[PDB]
């Protein structure tokens, strides 16, 4: 019932479940935290910005890797108007045989990609599932830099 | 071990084990005292 809202002693003394709920919803309101100065505020915001950019780059790297690994980017290059892009494969134990058959695309059940990443990456000059892997590797390196 | 075994190795791992340990840690942390 203590020590969770480390940034707020008023919440940490709450004997109810409201402390847990308000601890989540006030975690990023740095200006209202206990023992707070402006320098610490700007420094924490700066570090949070770095972590956020790292998260964005990791998300993009994950999209690239999953298109490279479980997608049909190379097949889509040769026939972009008939082949439907694949986002990533599906492994869900709750599937029946009918669901597996219906979601089956090429070798495994997979989700069609509605993000338009296939067309975007094709336009900027990507033609191989090894070009996407290089992008994922580089973006994970950039995320490490930002962290 | 082929690459197609990775989903069956990772999806249960992440989607069940990570919730369990994360719940353990979060409950322990939010139920601490001083």
């Amino acid at each position: 019932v203590y020590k969770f809202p480390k940034f707020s002693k008023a919440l940490a003394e709450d004997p109810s479940t409201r402390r847990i709920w308000y601890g989540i919803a006030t975690a990023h309101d740095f200006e209202s935290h206990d023992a707070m100065t402006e320098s610490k505020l700007y420094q924490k915001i700066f570090a949070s910005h770095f972590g956020h950019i790292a998260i964005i780059f990791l998300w993009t790297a994950g999209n690239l890797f999953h298109v490279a690994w479980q997608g049909n980017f190379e097949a889509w290059i040769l026939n972009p108007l008939k082949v439907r892009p694949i986002a990533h494969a599906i492994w869900d134990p709750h599937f029946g045989q009918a669901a597996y058959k219906a979601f089956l695309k090429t070798s495994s059940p997979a989700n069609l990609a509605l993000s338009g990443v296939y067309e975007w990456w094709y336009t900027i000059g990507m033609r191989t599932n090894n070009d996407l892997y290089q992008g994922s590797f580089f973006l994970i390196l950039l995320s490490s830099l930002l962290l | 071990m082929s690459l197609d075994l990775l989903p069956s190795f990772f999806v249960p791992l992440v989607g069940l084990v990570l919730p369990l340990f994360s719940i353990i840690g979060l409950f322990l942390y939010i139920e601490k005292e001083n």
Binding site: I140, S144 | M1
Partner: peptide, 30 residues
């Protein structure tokens, strides 16, 4: 089709990015 080595080293590099993330997470304090 990417190889096992390609996926494995990407997983290893992802682990390194994870240790860098907790270091940033712990440095942003409890």
């Amino acid at each position: 089709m990417i190889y096992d080595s390609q996926v494995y080293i990407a997983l290893v590099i992802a682990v390194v990015a994870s240790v860098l993330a907790i270091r940033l997470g712990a440095t942003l304090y409890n």
